[PDB]
Amino acid sequence: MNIFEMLRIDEGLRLKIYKDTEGYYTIGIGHLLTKSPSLNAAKSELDKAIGRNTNGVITKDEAEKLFNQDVDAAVRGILRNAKLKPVYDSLDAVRRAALINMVFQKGETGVAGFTNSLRMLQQKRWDEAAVNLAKSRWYNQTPNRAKRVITTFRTGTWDAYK
Ligand SMILES: [Cl-]
């Protein structure tokens, strides 16, 4: 199991533009196009991201490309965030995947904000962190996914995903 498989599970795959849990225009593997309410804008954005006139639809391959670029970026934002870096650096491999998941789903910034639980992860306070992480808008809006991640942070294993 690894990052890609993980996220692929959490985010699914759609070849046609859709609205996410928050109602935003998204595509492929959790690839967010826009916060705006215009399907057109979303279309523009897509074309631009794909490099062509898509008409709201893309190929699997394209979807995948987006995905790598996205995983890549997530990591990098992590590597560039003065708050994230240290944490990540101190984590074992499995757990990093978890931090990356969150970052992918909510943004560096978003994540950069879980100060306390980040602190907890740093000191390796698994159980406390999990509780902490649970008290969030994030958990409350996407309970099942949040659970997987949290479990993940908690045990250092892929069971949540098995
Ligand atoms: Cl969920």
From Swiss-Prot:
Protein purpose: Endolysin with lysozyme activity that degrades host peptidoglycans and participates with the holin and spanin proteins in the sequential events which lead to the programmed host cell lysis releasing the mature viral particles. Once the holin has permeabilized the host cell membrane, the endolysin can reach the periplasm and break down the peptidoglycan layer.
UniProt-annotated location(s): Host cytoplasm
Outcome of swapping residue 26 to H: Facilitates transglycosylation more effectively than hydrolysis; covalently bound substrate
Effect of residue 26 to E: Complete loss of activity at neutral pH; covalently bound substrate
Gene Ontology annotations of biological process type: cell wall macromolecule catabolic process; defense response to bacterium; peptidoglycan catabolic process; viral release from host cell by cytolysis
Keyword Hydrolase attributed: yes
The keyword Plastid is annotated on this UniProt entry: no
pH dependence: Optimum pH is 7.3.
Catalytic function, reaction form: Hydrolysis of (1->4)-beta-linkages between N-acetylmuramic acid and N-acetyl-D-glucosamine residues in a peptidoglycan and between N-acetyl-D-glucosamine residues in chitodextrins
Induction description: Expressed late in the viral replication.
Gene Ontology, cellular component aspect: host cell cytoplasm
Database matches in Pfam families: Phage_lysozyme
The protein's name in its UniProt record: Endolysin
Catalytic site: 11 (proton donor/acceptor), 20 (proton donor/acceptor)
GO molecular function (one): lysozyme activity
Organism name: Enterobacteria phage T4 (Bacteriophage T4)
